[PDB]
Symmetry: C4
Subunit: 197 residues, 4 copies
């Protein structure tokens, strides 16, 4: 049962679809484990009634900082890895996608535990760029996740199923998350413990 | 006998050319050895009566997976390497090109043998992006290869020859493949065996 | 107090705003320490009355050189790293940003000390590229810093504060710098000394 | 004496300027030493009466090959490194630039000596892409160097001088080359010999 037909069209139905511009980014982001790595995740959706093409996702952490020399930098900006090194930030965006940032040694979240998170003053800006297919007109969409909108120990509720030849997207579940057993340690300490043996 | 003239034009004739939109991607993909590496290959063609410019190729594996923590991800998407790291995904596309994905340790096909392949539930989406030369208008074309459309132990029939000052493309051979002696081991086991001595 | 609203708009006020085209690049660049690394920095601003989108920054060192084989290359051009490897050269440009080039072993400034700098015959060209949001029309802006416009031992005066729900930009401070305690050694010798113990 | 003014304009005069479209690529390419590395070089020029913006250069080697398994690939295409890894392929193109490909272990020219070169059946396609500044209209220009158009032991004659506040480009020298003392060994053997001691 193919997703993409030989003629370039998709066997996808967008069901239970709400203002279009509220189905671009999930209201919340989540942190939980995937294949042994702690990941920060958010969901992104296509434009309704118009497919987005040449799509790419980027993310910036905005967070005040002070250098060791004492320079205060208000709302310092730094790039959050969501696939730039591998080309995974170039999206094939038909049905909604969970974008995943692996919290590793290069992530600004490396040292942040479940207990520490709500004490942080931070904001993740997410930026989706691309082009309207039918128009060749460029577009950008943006949103953000402040500290309280990042849910530790949660995954996204899946939205995609296969029904009678159509891959069905239930947009009623676009924004929904559920709790799952998750460590409360920071990624750094989780790794250190795995490395012991 | 040059392919590209000093004036920027090409000495190429597009022969035996069929609906234009059926000569963008080969109907099938193939797996066989090239210079000691197992490769997954598909063929791509230019637009007829209009040269494509700023051309680039990308490929995504669509395949359901479950994380070790038990999260089911329907039709999980991951990028397949077709030249991003070297710039080889930026095409000079006049006569048809065989795009090659080397099956190495980072390839999602690394552990898949000839016997295992038909048991896999997967789909490779291929995406060609660029711009119509005469119009400066952007374009995208897409297709896909499901499991049964990937032929293990085959190469593409060449289409290009030199005839009286013209490089001749025989589009009668665009889609044709032929069988060739190929190992049935997975790339992983082929490598392990080469590494022994 | 969020910078970016869920609706994609920003809580930023551009205050005390002067010809728009004089608030694109700081008149001067500076060199000083950040978290133990010597950095060359310059400030960039958005377009007034029109937000710039898909923004990116690049920088070129223009400087005559002679190869060891004796070839003189007038105004040889080489790229200066301002984020290409990490994606940090892709800007989210609303309030003004300090662009930072870390002076490391790959920087053309690696061996240049405070005393040597004014003896150098060089020019840093800075190039901001992007697209006007409301128009989808592309744009480029350029400027440069000759030797005397690079200030060793200085930082930029911050411009951003939080006032009554708005992040306030004081463009009166866009161009201003202040002196700060800074080593006069070249980055190379600073590193060598840190490496001793 | 600055090249780029604070207002973004350049202090460059394009002198002794011929059909515009013949001053895009040098008729020939050259091979000679630069700072101990053997380099393949060609010259590129801006469009006359219209500055090119967002400019980038790429290069492809076209050369038939046979795999060790016996597959013949007519006019196989592979990317030639002219700055992709560092961003040096993104040009600031006002006065003509010498594009340099370092012949290292990853270059398809690594094993080719002065005596071997004329025996090779090959063609380097060069592709300049960008946008007309005044129009925001995209453009591409292409040319190529066959075997006999690659001159071993030559450099380009410089074109740029400083005269009364203007950097002067002498387009009479755009295409001219001169002979210089150069090793005749392949880059590979040159390196091996340097490595001995
Ligand atoms: Mg890149």
């Amino acid at each position: 049962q193919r997703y993409v037909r030989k003629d370039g069209k998709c066997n996808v139905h967008h069901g239970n679809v709400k203002r279009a511009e509220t189905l671009v980014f999930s209201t919340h982001a989540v942190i939980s484990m995937r294949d042994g790595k702690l990941c920060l995740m958010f969901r992104v959706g296509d434009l309704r009634n118009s497919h987005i093409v040449r799509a790419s996702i980027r993310a910036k952490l905005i967070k005040s900082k002070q250098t060791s020399e004492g320079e205060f930098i208000p709302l310092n900006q730094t790039d959050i890895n969501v696939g730039y090194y591998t080309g995974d930030d170039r999206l094939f965006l038909v049905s909604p996608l969970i974008i995943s940032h692996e919290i590793n040694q290069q992530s600004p979240f490396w040292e942040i535990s479940k207990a520490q998170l709500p004490k942080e003053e931070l904001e993740i800006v997410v930026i989706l760029e691309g082009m309207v297919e039918a128009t060749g007109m460029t577009c950008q969409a943006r949103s953000s996740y402040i500290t309280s909108e990042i849910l530790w120990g949660y995954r996204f509720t899946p939205v995609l199923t296969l029904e009678d030849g159509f891959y069905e997207v239930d947009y009623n579940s676009f924004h929904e998350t559920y709790e799952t057993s998750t460590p409360s340690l920071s990624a750094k300490e989780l790794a250190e413990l795995a490395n012991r043996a």
